[PDB]
């Protein structure tokens, strides 16, 4: 497992070298190969087959698959995900965990926005127990998202809509 605490600072260091070498600038003054910088790095994080390990180790290791999982970190400016470096890395990765300032200030400490966060691998990367219990959790959090306003006026709600809301507030 590898953590790159700031890929945005690596991009800033590569931009500095490129401008000092007098290479032609593009959007936000980054060089024409800033996408290739992060893509060449992030495509190494992978899972390799048993045949690859058997070929690499000259038969010393057999029947086992190796892997490298990556958790790159990027810092946005005022929630702007459309900036050049954030846009490149969002398109290279398998999924995104979005943290929000409004949720973090509302006491929701691990500030994960479940509505936009995605994992394209999905249940293939989950144990049987978690996969089975996770489906109900997602429905509740979606319901609460569609019924949050009715929390300051719960008195006037159907029992069933009132019910969905109370399960949502507890799961959250």
């Amino acid at each position: 497992l590898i953590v790159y605490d700031d890929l945005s600072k690596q991009a800033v260091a590569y931009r500095q070298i490129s401008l000092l070498l007098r290479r032609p600038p593009g959007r936000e003054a980054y060089p024409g190969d800033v996408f290739y910088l992060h893509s060449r790095l992030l495509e190494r994080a992978s899972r390799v087959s048993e045949e690859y390990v058997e070929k690499f180790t000259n038969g010393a290791v057999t029947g086992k698959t190796g892997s490298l999982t990556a958790l790159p970190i990027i810092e946005t400016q005022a929630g702007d995900v459309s900036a050049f470096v954030p846009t490149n890395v969002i398109s290279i990765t398998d999924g995104q965990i979005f943290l929000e300032s409004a949720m973090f200030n509302s006491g929701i400490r691990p500030a994960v926005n479940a509505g936009i966060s995605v994992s394209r691998v999905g249940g293939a990367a989950q144990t049987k127990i978690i996969k089975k219990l996770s489906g109900g959790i997602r429905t509740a959090l979606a319901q609460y998202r569609e019924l949050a306003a009715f929390a300051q006026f719960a008195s006037d709600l159907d029992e069933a809509t009132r019910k969905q809301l109370e399960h949502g507030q507890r799961v959250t």
């Binding site: 032609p24 600038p25 024409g32 846009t87 398109s91």
Partner: protein
């Protein structure tokens, strides 16, 4: 184009037409050319036209293309989506809501459109 010349009707699938535009922007910046509006390459419309004009129906056969489209910042007026929409003949929209009802394929009969 070789299969078309055998007298066939062919399907050309392009994984993402936005990445073709971005690769052109990257190459244009590496060659030092002066950038255009919103930072795209000055050759944006010509590079799209050179690719899209080969996909046609001819006297021998035809090439039909299905291209996945990405919209930057959800802005349909951005130069990349705007240059691409001038070549498209149909728009197929896939809906997460329709897939939730158990219907497959998840096409949205109201948002999807065709010039035909």
């Amino acid at each position: 184009e070789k299969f078309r010349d055998e007298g066939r009707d062919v399907l050309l699938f392009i994984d993402n037409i936005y990445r073709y535009t971005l690769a052109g922007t990257e190459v244009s910046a590496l060659l030092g050319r002066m950038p255009s509006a919103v930072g795209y390459q000055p050759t944006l419309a010509e590079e799209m036209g050179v690719l899209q004009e080969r996909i046609t129906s001819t006297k021998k056969g035809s090439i039909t293309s299905i291209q996945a489209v990405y919209v930057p910042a959800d802005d349909l007026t951005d130069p990349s989506p705007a240059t691409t929409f001038a070549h498209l003949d149909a728009t197929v929209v896939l809906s997460r809501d329709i897939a939730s009802l158990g219907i497959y394929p998840a096409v949205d009969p109201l948002d999807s459109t065709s010039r035909q």
